[PDB]
A paper describes a structure:
In agreement with [name] enzyme kinetics, the activity was decreased in the S62A and [name] variants by 13% and 60% (versus wt-[name]-2), respectively. The substantial change in [name] enzymatic activity despite ∼9 Å between the mutation and catalytic sites implies long-range communication within the [name]-2 structure. Surprisingly, the [name] variant has a higher RMSD (1.245 Å) with wt-[name]-2, displaying substantial conformational changes in the β-strand housing the [name] mutation, the C-terminal region, and the loop 63 to 69 connecting the third β-strand to the second α-helix. These changes were not observed in the Y99A [name] mutant, but in [name]-2, this mutation induces the adjacent Pro101 from each subunit to form a “lid” over the solvent cavity to separate external and internal water molecules. There are significant differences in the [name] variant including a conformational change in the active site residue Ile64 and increased dynamics of the active site Arg36 and C-terminal Met114 side chains (dynamics are interpreted from the absence of electron density). In addition, the expansion in the [name] variant is also only 0.9 Å due to the loss of the large side chain near the mouth of the cavity and movement of Pro101 into this space, a conformational change not observed in Tyr99 [name] variants. There is an even slightly smaller network of water molecules trapped between Pro101 and Arg42 in [name] [name]-2, which has a kcat/Km ∼40% of wt-[name]-2. It must be noted that changes in the [name] water network are partly due to the truncation of the solvent cavity from multiple conformational changes. However, [name] displays more line broadening, particularly in residues 60 to 65 that were noted to undergo a conformational change in the [name] crystal structure. The P1G and [name] variants show similar levels of dynamic perturbation; however, the effects of [name] are strongest at the C terminus, most notably residues Ile107 and Ile110, which have been purported to be involved in [name] activation. Before our X-ray structure of [name] [name]-2 showed significant conformational changes, it was unclear why a Phe100 mutation would have a larger effect on the activity in [name]-2.
pmcThe human macrophage migration inhibitory factor ([name]) superfamily, comprised of [name] and [name] ([name], also called [name]-2), is broadly and constitutively expressed with involvement in proinflammatory and host antimicrobial responses. [name] and [name]-2 are highly similar in structure, with monomeric units of 114 and 117 amino acids, respectively, that form homotrimers. An evolutionarily conserved proline at the N terminus acts as the catalytic base for a tautomerization reaction of unknown biological significance in both proteins. The same site in [name]-2 is Phe100 and is also evolutionarily conserved among all [name]-2 proteins, suggesting this site plays an important role in both proteins.
Numbering used by the authors:
A (entry chain A), B (entry chain A), C (entry chain A): 1 to 109
Amino acid sequence: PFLELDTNLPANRVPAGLEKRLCAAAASILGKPADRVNVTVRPGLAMALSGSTEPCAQLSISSIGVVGTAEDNRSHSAHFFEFLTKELALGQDRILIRFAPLESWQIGK
Amino acid sequence: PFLELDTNLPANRVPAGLEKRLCAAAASILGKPADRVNVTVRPGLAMALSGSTEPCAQLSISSIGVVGTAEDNRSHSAHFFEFLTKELALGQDRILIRFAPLESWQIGK
Amino acid sequence: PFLELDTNLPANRVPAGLEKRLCAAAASILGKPADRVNVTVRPGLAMALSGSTEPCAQLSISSIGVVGTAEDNRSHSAHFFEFLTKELALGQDRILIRFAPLESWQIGK
């Protein structure tokens, strides 16, 4: 799976190594080997979340599989909220997680 | 819905509060409560649009619903072109709007 | 089609004009007119790819068509790996290409 985190927090307020710790958390939360987890963090953006420009973050989670995922995605989301509220010092109401489809992916040889 | 705007305009040429005014415009254009509208602006990127590196912007609009949306999406697109050409001082030919699917989204509690 | 390249390479290590040369390469590789090719490059991000924070890049390729694309997407991916390894001085194992769906897109008038 692929995690993409956009935030309007300034770069200096996003913890160093967030991408490493979020990768490890995702591996544990999603029950996937770390070598199948991808994380991208984009800070310093201009953002409105739920109509408000207060500090916030958007997390996209992309993957090929769709069938039967709704319930597990709710469970996973709750743990990512726990993780991100602590790391980013953001209230859970200022974090939104969305699930997006992929057709395929390939690592280079 | 979720709006994501990438542009190769330098940060200092993207208006302050664009994300707030685009959020309000989206609420009005899409006929959705502002608390369901999300906007992310990513400036200063390196971009080619329709084969050209002149100043440009890409707007992605993501949402769960797909059925019956083609005609309304054309109407909405025209108003977002109006809004963005004024705000960014870009010709409408240098703005591209694309519509992408989501499976679900959740706000934290 | 729409190419979006995220990388944790610093901005000064991403070649100037990468978006122009990647646009031309995509036109040739995909067999599409350059005026239908779009490229966005986002550098300086914090990233983990396949569980590792070593230098890396993610390329997303989005398009409306899905039917019958798996084999051609494998061919195209291999050429984009060739192109990006040279431009970015990254091993092919540090580049991941993913294919995502679009419902529609519109250029402004």
